[PDB]
Amino acid sequence: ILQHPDGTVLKQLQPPPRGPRELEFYNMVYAADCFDGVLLELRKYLPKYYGIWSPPTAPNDLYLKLEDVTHKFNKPCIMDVKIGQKSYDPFASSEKIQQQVSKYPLMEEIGFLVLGMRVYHVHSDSYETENQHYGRSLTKETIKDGVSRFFHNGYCLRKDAVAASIQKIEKILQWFENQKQLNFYASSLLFVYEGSGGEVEVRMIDFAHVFPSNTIDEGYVYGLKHLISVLRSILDN
Numbered sequence: 001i002l003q004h005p006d007g008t009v010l011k012q013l014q015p016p017p018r019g020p021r022e023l024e025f026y027n028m029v030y031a032a033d034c035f036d037g038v039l040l041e042l043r044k045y046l047p048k049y050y051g052i053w054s055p056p057t058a059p060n061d062l063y064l065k066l067e068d069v070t071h072k073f074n075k076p077c078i079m080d081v082k083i084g085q086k087s088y089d090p091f092a093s094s095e096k097i098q099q100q101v102s103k104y105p106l107m108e109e110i111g112f113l114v115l116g117m118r119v120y121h122v123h124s125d126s127y128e129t130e131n132q133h134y135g136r137s138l139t140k141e142t143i144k145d146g147v148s149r150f151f152h153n154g155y156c157l158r159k160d161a162v163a164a165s166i167q168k169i170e171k172i173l174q175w176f177e178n179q180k181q182l183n184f185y186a187s188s189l190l191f192v193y194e195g196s197g198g199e200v201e202v203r204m205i206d207f208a209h210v211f212p213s214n215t216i217d218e219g220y221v222y223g224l225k226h227l228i229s230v231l232r233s234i235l236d237n
């Protein structure tokens, strides 16, 4: 992710087939002739899409120009959560399935994985960052506290942001409960709140493994529901 002062991020297309798939996903969704009400509603929950972008002198070098979801924040607190029971897609090999499950074998059980968080602490005027290994360390025993960490400013638990996150996730869940045409693997929710009341972003990102489907995305739903349940329990801290 490259953060542009103009309020966008540039995301470089991943190597094929993933990068091209993500381009096609955005293209399909933000198709200017798209009257599909499912895809029209989905736009609300994605970064705004400004089309494919390449440097003036390098047509080879492909990026997506996306809304920076953090842009309107002063001190954004950012958490990326991979959603679903499976982070491998329907066309993965045995090896690829094994690669994906081994990365985090609790994916089926929990239905989400914290990819990272960046949390502004007021009293130190600084950020705590957690990486891949943080979320991949979390077990059933420690997931609730693992998530809670995101909402700690080093003086209070930001229950406002927790409650707001549930409310926004709920609308995304409603979207998924009303569509049977897309299944989403290894995709994420980007949570943002103000670290400097209820000012929150929750957006879907990372679409290198979104496939056509005939069924409810049950794995994504399970993850949203479980994530909500964790967030709900945190409101009782």
Ligand SMILES: c1cc(-c2onc3ccc(-c4nnn[nH]4)cc23)cc(C2CCN(C3CCC3)CC2)c1
Pocket: 001, 009, 011, 047, 066, 067, 068, 069, 070, 078, 079, 080, 115, 116, 117, 131, 132, 190, 205, 206, 207
């Ligand atoms: C500032 C802005 C964004 C961001 O803001 N708007 C965004 C829109 C899309 C994406 C995006 N799409 N695909 N992957 N990221 C990312 C966006 C994302 C971040 C961080 C960038 C680093 N990622 C990594 C670290 C854990 C995974 C966590 C999220 C920081």
